[PDB]
């Protein structure tokens, strides 16, 4: 009952069959959208 | 990946963790050390 | 979703040292190509010069076939090159 047991059979059932090279998206036409930034930690030389 | 790379890392090599959320969003934020090139233009030394 | 099943499918028994040929007294073709980002740097003390390049390796093997016509017409699907045969240039 606690946080633990919850999270990891979460995670025991969405790991269960999941490949990791197949492209994840809903039809094959469809494509993927990768919303991308950056943040400078600093500017070494 | 990068394209302008000398001689560094083409990726990120640390490979940190994600957040994933209910929806099925997924979030991910390595640190990463970069080398790129630049087509340094010297003319107003030191103005530059 | 079909990806995923074509590459389960595919990866079923395939070796990776095997030279993939159908019969042994046959050969491959592995095209090759160059390119160059950028002349990084040609020391001349040391002699030695660092490039930055693009290989481009082009062959074909039997084992990968499949047919579009039974996968939702897919003809062009993504894999890891770690878990396949490699000439080694």
Same mark, same amino acid.
């Given at each position: 009952?606690? $946080?633990?047991? @919850?999270?990891?059979?979460?995670?025991?059932?969405?790991?269960? =069959?999941?490949?990791?090279?197949? $492209?994840?998206? @809903?039809?094959?036409?469809?494509?993927?959208?990768?919303?991308? =930034?950056?943040?400078?930690?600093?500017?070494?030389? | 990946?990068?394209?302008?790379?000398?001689?560094?890392?083409?990726?990120?090599?640390?490979?940190?963790?994600?957040?994933?959320?209910?929806?099925?969003?997924?979030?991910?934020?390595?640190?990463?050390?970069?080398?790129?090139?630049?087509?340094?233009?010297?003319?107003?030394?030191?103005?530059? | 979703?079909?990806?995923?099943?074509?590459?389960?499918?595919?990866?079923?028994?395939?070796?990776?040292?095997?030279?993939?040929?159908?019969?042994?007294?046959?050969?491959?073709?592995?095209?090759?190509?160059?390119?160059?980002?950028?002349?990084?740097?040609?020391?001349?003390?040391?002699?030695?010069?660092?490039?930055?390049?693009?290989?481009?390796?082009?062959?074909?093997?039997?084992?990968?076939?499949?047919?579009?016509?039974?996968?939702?017409?897919?003809?062009?699907?993504?894999?890891?090159?770690?878990?396949?045969?490699?000439?080694?240039?």
């Amino acid at each position: 009952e606690t $946080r633990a047991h @919850a999270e990891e059979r979460l995670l025991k059932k969405l790991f269960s =069959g999941y490949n990791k090279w197949s $492209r994840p998206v @809903a039809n094959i036409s469809d494509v993927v959208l990768v919303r991308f =930034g950056l943040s400078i930690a600093q500017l070494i030389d | 990946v990068l394209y302008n790379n000398a001689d560094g890392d083409f990726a990120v090599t640390h490979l940190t963790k994600a957040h994933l959320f209910h929806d099925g969003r997924v979030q991910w934020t390595p640190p990463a050390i970069y080398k790129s090139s630049c087509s340094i233009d010297v003319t107003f030394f030191p103005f530059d | 979703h079909a990806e995923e099943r074509l590459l389960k499918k595919l990866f079923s028994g395939y070796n990776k040292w095997s030279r993939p040929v159908a019969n042994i007294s046959d050969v491959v073709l592995v095209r090759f190509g160059l390119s160059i980002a950028q002349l990084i740097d040609v020391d001349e003390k040391n002699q030695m010069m660092t490039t930055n390049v693009w290989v481009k390796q082009e062959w074909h093997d039997y084992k990968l076939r499949w047919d579009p016509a039974d996968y939702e017409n897919v003809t062009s699907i993504r894999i890891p090159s770690e878990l396949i045969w490699r000439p080694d240039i």
